[PDB]
Scaffold this motif. Structure first.
Motif, short mmCIF file in Angstrom:
data_model
loop_
_atom_site.label_atom_id
_atom_site.label_comp_id
_atom_site.label_asym_id
_atom_site.label_seq_id
_atom_site.Cartn_x
_atom_site.Cartn_y
_atom_site.Cartn_z
N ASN A 217 0.83 -1.20 0.00
CA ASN A 217 0.00 0.00 0.00
C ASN A 217 0.86 1.25 0.00
N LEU A 218 1.95 1.24 0.78
CA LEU A 218 2.89 2.35 0.75
C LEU A 218 3.47 2.54 -0.65
N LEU A 219 3.77 1.44 -1.33
CA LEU A 219 4.32 1.53 -2.68
C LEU A 219 3.33 2.16 -3.66
N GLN A 220 2.06 1.75 -3.61
CA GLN A 220 1.07 2.41 -4.47
C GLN A 220 0.91 3.89 -4.10
N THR A 221 0.91 4.21 -2.81
CA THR A 221 0.73 5.59 -2.38
C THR A 221 2.01 6.41 -2.45
N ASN A 222 3.13 5.80 -2.85
CA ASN A 222 4.42 6.48 -2.95
C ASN A 222 4.85 7.06 -1.61
N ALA A 223 4.42 6.43 -0.52
CA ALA A 223 4.72 6.91 0.81
C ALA A 223 6.14 6.51 1.22
N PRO A 224 6.76 7.27 2.12
CA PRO A 224 8.10 6.91 2.60
C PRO A 224 8.09 5.53 3.25
N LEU A 225 9.17 4.79 3.05
CA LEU A 225 9.24 3.43 3.60
C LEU A 225 10.65 3.11 4.06
N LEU A 226 10.75 2.16 4.98
CA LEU A 226 12.03 1.78 5.55
C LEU A 226 12.72 0.73 4.70
N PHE A 227 14.05 0.72 4.77
CA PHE A 227 14.85 -0.18 3.95
C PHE A 227 16.18 -0.44 4.64
N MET A 228 16.55 -1.72 4.74
CA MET A 228 17.83 -2.11 5.31
C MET A 228 18.80 -2.46 4.20
N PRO A 229 19.89 -1.71 4.03
CA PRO A 229 20.92 -2.08 3.06
C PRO A 229 21.95 -3.03 3.66
N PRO B 286 24.31 5.94 7.96
CA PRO B 286 24.93 4.61 8.09
C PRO B 286 24.44 3.68 7.00
N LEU B 287 25.35 2.83 6.52
CA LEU B 287 25.03 1.86 5.49
C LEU B 287 24.63 0.51 6.07
N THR B 288 24.51 0.41 7.39
CA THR B 288 24.13 -0.84 8.05
C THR B 288 22.93 -0.65 8.97
N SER B 289 22.16 0.42 8.79
CA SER B 289 21.01 0.73 9.63
C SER B 289 19.80 0.99 8.74
N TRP B 290 18.63 1.03 9.38
CA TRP B 290 17.41 1.35 8.66
C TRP B 290 17.51 2.73 8.04
N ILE B 291 17.08 2.85 6.79
CA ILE B 291 17.08 4.11 6.06
C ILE B 291 15.69 4.33 5.49
N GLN B 292 15.15 5.53 5.69
CA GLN B 292 13.83 5.87 5.19
C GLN B 292 13.94 6.51 3.81
N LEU B 293 13.16 5.99 2.87
CA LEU B 293 13.09 6.50 1.51
C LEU B 293 11.86 7.38 1.37
N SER C 195 18.10 9.13 7.23
CA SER C 195 18.45 8.06 8.16
C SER C 195 17.32 7.84 9.15
N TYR C 196 17.00 6.58 9.42
CA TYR C 196 15.94 6.20 10.35
C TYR C 196 16.62 5.58 11.57
N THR D 212 17.78 10.44 -4.28
CA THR D 212 18.85 11.41 -4.13
C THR D 212 19.16 11.56 -2.65
N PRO D 213 20.37 12.00 -2.30
CA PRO D 213 20.71 12.13 -0.87
C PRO D 213 19.76 13.04 -0.11
N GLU D 214 19.26 14.10 -0.75
CA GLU D 214 18.31 14.99 -0.09
C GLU D 214 16.97 14.32 0.17
#
Ligand SMILES: Nc1ccn([C@H]2C[C@H](O)[C@@H](COP(=O)(O)OP(=O)(O)OP(=O)(O)O)O2)c(=O)n1
Ligand SMILES: Nc1ccn([C@H]2C[C@H](O)[C@@H](COP(=O)(O)OP(=O)(O)OP(=O)(O)O)O2)c(=O)n1
Ligand SMILES: [Mg+2]
Ligand SMILES: [Mg+2]
Length: 986
Positions: free
Chosen positions: A23-35, A164-171, A194-195, A188-190
DNA sequence: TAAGGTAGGGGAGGAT
DNA sequence: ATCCTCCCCTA
């Protein structure tokens, strides 16, 4: 057959959060991501490729574009400087984006309150290659350069963006595109934040894989270079990054295998087909981490070489790399990391060769386990499983499973597949039980590095990256730091810590308490403001700073027979004046203090529960884990000190390391003098620890009680009990007084002494060589374990004979004995034990004599070099004879091998060299080679016992001898030798 | 291509 | 036998 790829597996396992994520993806809402995995495009426009898992577990690729690729150099502020640099760069045919000008604080040299800021110009590039070549040219020409990470740029991006590249990041405001199983995000970085708060449960996928190979010739490890040798089985399992239960399991094999409900079986007809199926399953699962035990030495090289033989490396790599299409030459040049060196500890490095497919991070469980256990004698999977208390793996024997592949038996193939799946499960169990991945993630967050750095790299560059990250923040004024060492480097050693000549001998009457500095070198850094940006090198500048009222700590030492002097500006307990090194060390010390208090409470809760309780064991394990964590932090902080003393480091400052060492020596001597002046006796000192004894008067009255009783054994045990209690309380009061004295001296509370245990019966045999019975909270003389530091029994590669003899010596010396009763000195105890060992020779079996040594071809260890030169000659002779010589094969460089010393018959030529007497354990057991026990005695245990007995007067040298300890040791060696020939019937 | 530091004990082998 | 260097491992 439902062959579920990553998407359906994630949807089935976590349906509600999957629906929310969709649902977040359809709504283009910010979402968390672990790299997890980070990849860079060094040529052309720079893009940062992160690969990882969404909140529910969907595989996602995040492409960060328009990242400023830059590096800055300090030059004066004038408009013609920009044009001059334009001309310089264009003359070297270097394409650049733009120029910027700013002010930053140089990291080297103290500057006045209005002169911290110095001009800098920032050079921008479209590509990493252009930035690299420009940095190289500019530094070769001679400009001072900062922010110049050349080996990689993702670390600089991570530390610059506070990401950080090892923590949750919000898109946020991302560009989404689903292709196949990969949800690609163009951000983009802007637009990428970071979450840091309350990070949810991580849903990364780690697959453990193991391979079984076949070779027609028996008794040999299947060589991938050999055409007939073949890899015939691959068993793989996917797990959550935190859970040991398998999400899915797949086995690929040559011979037909009966269907099993525990895993999906894929049948292949050829090695090319099997490798293609492995690549297909890897692509379908698209794991965030691919892991295996010893895969960087055996599995990955075997797979890569076989695929080259079949010419399908490009195909399988492109299938495994999501959509990353790369040619074979590019794959071999860059992505197939070959012969990578991984530092396990000091003077210990291992090799690692793997195929680093983008989108997945390769993990060698053996590398992680050896990093967690750098002093482990055995590095096998079984040993690592046993060490951490995990269940024993049912070993698959050699000839059984090669026979099973030969017979083409379906159920035997299924059993081999089951054991391979168990191997993968053990890999994941080791990964989870030690919490390896979360710990590496925490290290990456702390040091602003990728997970790959936390896996395959040591901590020095992490220390540098953390320092630069803490330096580039506006609260600190944007300190500018370089990342590559500059300036001429010298060869030698600066003066180090001070070790007090111990009062050698056994002590059974005056309890001895070790008081240790809490984080000695970090505390000195905080107290004296040891930091390169607070460092003054010239005497006149220091005098001028004194004239302005600033307090400076002055240090001087002798390095390379020359005087190195320096001055450091004190922070005056003002947070504004606090140095960069002190600030980072304050943060690290707060973290370690929280860890230490948590460890202390867990230790006090574990001490009140008896060990037979079912919940104790794992809880005890948890205790060790916490200890390990703080230990790591300790090492990490100590690395800061070391990073200032390493001439190859960008942050190298010989005055800083020399000042830390000299301040440690001065503080140790100051506390020594203060304690002596308060009437307390001191037995030993080492860097920061002082071992102190109470005055006898403090134990008078309690002794009177024992003097007023009939003095039974339990009376003296009780007397020792309250002697230890009085010790503990007196050392607590003395520790408080000494801490107050240090606070009055240096003006800060960072330098604090701490009580850790009491060693009432304690023997100091030499520098960094002592032992005793440890009492932490309450006296307990019924503990078989002994606090031991430096004795040869704990040495790596030591015989079990030496360990047994040393343990007997120490347990006999630590026995409580009333002063009225007979108290044998160390001479009599050592002589009795040695006589028992030599005379009663039958007590020693073959297992007591195995030694372990590390084969380093680049190191000229003459004994082992000669031993294996003889083995190479014997192998040549056997191959000439045509017989198999695999049992005498050279171990792969780096690993440790077991060997024994044998009785080489005298053929009156037969040198007494240890090199000619070493033999592998296998043939010594096979051919029943006699063990040269007297050699073992006279060369190891005799010298061990000499250290125990060296304190006697008869072995003491005349006062003219400068090295009293060495002379006494040699004299004790000779005396014990003569005793041995006297007692041994020849 | 990465890789914190120094102080110190003691075995092995060779010069001597 | 002494002394020295290299090496391993610990402090
Ligand atoms: N790998 C190591 C271990 C120790 N030390 C030095 C730094 C320490 O400051 C000093 C003191 O020894 P400790 O083992 O006591 O380490 P700390 O005092 O720093 O921390 P802690 O007191 O908690 O043990 O030894 C070091 O440089 N490197
Ligand atoms: N790698 C190490 C280990 C220890 N130490 C010093 C600091 C402290 C002291 C600890 O010695 P005790 O264990 O005798 O040794 C050191 O400088 N470096
Ligand atoms: Mg196996
Ligand atoms: Mg300490």
């Amino acid at each position: 057959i439902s062959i579920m790829d990553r998407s359906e597996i994630v949807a089935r396992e976590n349906p509600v959060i999957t629906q929310r994520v969709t649902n977040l993806l359809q709504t283009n809402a910010p979402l968390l991501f672990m790299p997890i995995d980070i990849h860079e495009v060094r040529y052309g426009a720079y893009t940062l490729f992160m690969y990882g898992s969404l909140e529910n577990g969907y595989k996602a690729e995040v492409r960060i574009e328009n990242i400023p690729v830059f590096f800055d150099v300090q030059i004066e502020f004038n408009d013609t400087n920009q044009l001059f640099l334009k001309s310089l760069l264009t003359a070297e045919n270097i394409v650049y984006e733009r120029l910027e000008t700013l002010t930053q604080r140089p990291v080297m040299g103290y500057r006045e309150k209005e002169k911290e800021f110095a001009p800098y110009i920032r050079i921008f590039f479209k590509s990493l290659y252009e930035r690299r070549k420009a940095i190289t040219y500019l530094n070769n020409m001679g400009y001072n350069t900062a922010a110049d990470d050349t080996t990689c740029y993702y670390r600089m991006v991570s530390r610059e963006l506070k990401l950080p590249l090892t923590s949750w990041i919000q898109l946020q405001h991302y560009s989404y595109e689903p292709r196949g199983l990969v949800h690609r995000f163009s951000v983009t970085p802007e637009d990428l934040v970071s979450y840091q708060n309350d990070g949810p449960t991580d849903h990364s996928i780690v697959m453990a894989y193991d391979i079984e190979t076949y070779s027609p010739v028996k008794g040999t490890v299947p060589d991938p270079n050999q055409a007939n040798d073949v890899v015939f089985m691959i068993c793989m399992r996917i797990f959550w990054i935190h859970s040991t239960e398998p999400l899915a399991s797949t086995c690929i094999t040559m011979a037909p295998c009966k269907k099993s409900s525990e895993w999906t079986t894929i049948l292949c007809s050829s090695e090319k087909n099997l490798l293609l199926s492995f690549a297909e399953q890897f692509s379908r699962w698209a794991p965030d981490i691919c892991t295996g035990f010893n895969d960087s030495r055996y599995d990955w090289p075997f797979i890569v070489e076989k695929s080259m033989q079949h010419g399908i490396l490009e195909e399988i790599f492109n299938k495994m790399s999501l959509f990353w299409h790369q040619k074979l030459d590019t794959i071999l040049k860059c992505y197939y990391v070959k012969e990578k060196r991984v530092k396990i500890s000091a003077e210990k490095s291992i090799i690692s060769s793997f195929l680093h497919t983008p989108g997945c991070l390769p993990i060698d469980v053996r590398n992680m386990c050896m990093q967690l256990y750098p002093k482990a004698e055995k590095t096998s999977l079984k040993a690592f499983l046993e060490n951490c208390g995990l269940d024993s793996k049912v070993d698959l024997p050699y000839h059984l499973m090669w026979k099973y592949y030969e017979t083409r038996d379906s159920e035997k193939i299924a059993d081999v597949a089951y054991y391979c799946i168990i191997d993968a499960q053990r890999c994941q169990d080791l990964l989870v039980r030690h919490n390896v991945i979360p710990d590496r993630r925490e290290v990456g967050i702390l040091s602003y590095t990728s997970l790959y750095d936390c896996i395959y790299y040591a901590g020095g560059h992490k220390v540098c990256n953390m320092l630069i990250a803490y330096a580039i923040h506006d609260e600190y004024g944007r300190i500018a730091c370089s990342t590559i060492a500059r300036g001429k480097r010298e060869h030698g050693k600066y003066p180090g810590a001070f070790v007090i000549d111990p009062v050698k001998g056994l002590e059974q009457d005056k309890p001895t308490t070790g008081l240790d500095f809490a984080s000695l070198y970090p505390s000195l850094i905080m107290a004296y403001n040891f930091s390169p940006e607070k460092f003054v090198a010239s005497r006149d500048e220091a005098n001028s700073l004194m004239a302005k009222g600033e307090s400076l700590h002055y240090v001087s030492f002798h390095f390379n027979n020359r005087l190195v002097e320096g001055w450091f500006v004190w922070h005056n307990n003002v947070p504004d004046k606090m140095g960069l090194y002190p600030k980072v060390l304050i943060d690290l010390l707060n973290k370690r203090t929280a860890l230490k208090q948590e460890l202390k409470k867990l230790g006090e809760k574990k001490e009140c529960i008896h060990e037979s309780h079912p919940g104790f064991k794992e809880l005890q394990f948890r205790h060790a884990m916490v200890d390990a964590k703080q230990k790591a932090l300790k090492i990490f902080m100590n690395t800061f000190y070391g990073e200032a003393g390493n001439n190859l480091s960008p942050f190298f400052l010989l005055p800083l390391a020399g000042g830390v060492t000299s301040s440690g020596q001065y503080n140790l001597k100051l506390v020594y003098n203060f304690v002596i002046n308060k009437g307390y006796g001191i037995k030993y000192g080492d860097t920061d620890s002082l071992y102190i004894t109470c005055p006898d008067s403090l134990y008078t009255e309690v002794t009177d009680a024992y003097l007023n009783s009939q003095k039974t054994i339990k009376h003296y045990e009780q007397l020792c009990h309250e002697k230890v209690l009085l010790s503990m309380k007196a050392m607590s009061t003395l520790c408080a007084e000494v801490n107050e004295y240090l606070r009055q001296d240096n003006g800060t509370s960072y330098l604090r002494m701490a009580y850790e245990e009491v060693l009432f019966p304690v023997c100091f045999t030499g520098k960094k060589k002592y032992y005793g019975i440890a009492h932490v909270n309450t006296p307990n003389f019924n503990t078989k374990e002994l606090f031991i530091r430096g004795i040869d029994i704990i040495k790596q590669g030591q015989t079990k004979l030496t360990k047994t003899i040393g343990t007997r010596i120490m347990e006999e010396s630590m026995k409580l004995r009333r002063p009225e009763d007979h108290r044998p000195p160390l001479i009599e105890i050592v002589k009795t034990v040695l006589k028992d060992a030599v005379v009663n020779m039958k007590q020693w079996n073959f297992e007591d004599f195995i030694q372990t040594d590390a084969w380093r071809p680049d190191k000229d260890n003459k004994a082992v070099q000669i031993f294996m030169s003889r083995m190479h000659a014997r192998r040549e002779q056997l191959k000439k004879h045509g017989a198999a010589a695999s049992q005498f094969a050279e171990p792969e460089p780096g690993e440790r091998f077991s060997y024994v010393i044998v009785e080489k018959q005298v053929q009156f030529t037969d040198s007494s060299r240890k090199g000619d007497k070493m033999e592998y354990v296998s043939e010594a057991k096979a051919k029943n080679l006699p063990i040269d026990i007297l050699f073992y005695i006279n060369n190891y245990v005799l010298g061990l016992c000499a250290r125990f007995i060296n304190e006697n007067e008869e072995f003491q040298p005349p006062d003219n001898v400068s090295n009293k300890d060495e002379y006494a040791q040699r004299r004790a060696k000779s005396y014990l030798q003569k005793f041995v020939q006297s007692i041994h019937p020849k």
